[PDB]
Amino acid sequence: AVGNFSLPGFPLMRGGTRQEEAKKDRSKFLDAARSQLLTGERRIFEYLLCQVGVGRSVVVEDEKEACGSRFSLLWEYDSAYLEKGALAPEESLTVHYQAVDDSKGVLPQYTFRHDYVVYDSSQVLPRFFLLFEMDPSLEELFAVPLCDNCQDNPACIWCPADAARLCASCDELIHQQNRLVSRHIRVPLNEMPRAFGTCRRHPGEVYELFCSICHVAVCRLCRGNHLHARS
């Protein structure tokens, strides 16, 4: 699998007349997230980052005909692109557990999944034996939230006067109910003034400076372990 793959044990709901009336599935999603604290059974994911070298692939249908004993590629073509296979993933909605309360979550969009059948061992070079950890109770920094009023679609406009986070369809409705509220200045969501953030290698106090050799934020206690401390 080259691309976006799904991992079991993750909050992963659905993106998005007589089909939209089942919108209550998102309301039940947020009901279940608040009803149960989710350790989510964090796991022992042991993966092999294989540098799979595919090349000059022939387009092939699902896996049952790309099985080695029934296709028999030439020496030019070297892999088989499974066109109508894999899953081709989806999805925005995902709970976050921001600080001490629940939210949502609009994950990164524009996904794919392209699967290639490789038939000889020298096209696969294992590189790293990655042991990694997936826990839903940690922070999810890809954290586009929804409209406060409409509680629905992903917000992309922040009115600093209104102190509310809004998507386009609700944001028009915020400013038309009165003549007075039409003239609120409307900055997009972008990078609203929120904070600068406390340090991660030790909590409590916020970042103050910048490093510029290894590009990372520097706090007041951080320059001592910085070897170049000036830049």
């Binding site: 387009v59 692109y81 066109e83 524009y110 794919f112 392209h114």
Partner: peptide, 18 residues
């Protein structure tokens, strides 16, 4: 959104049966 978009979804289907 933010460039990309219309060129991403057109070459997502790399099987050139056109």
């Amino acid at each position: 959104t933010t460039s990309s978009a219309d060129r991403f979804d057109r070459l997502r289907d790399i099987s050139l049966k056109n």
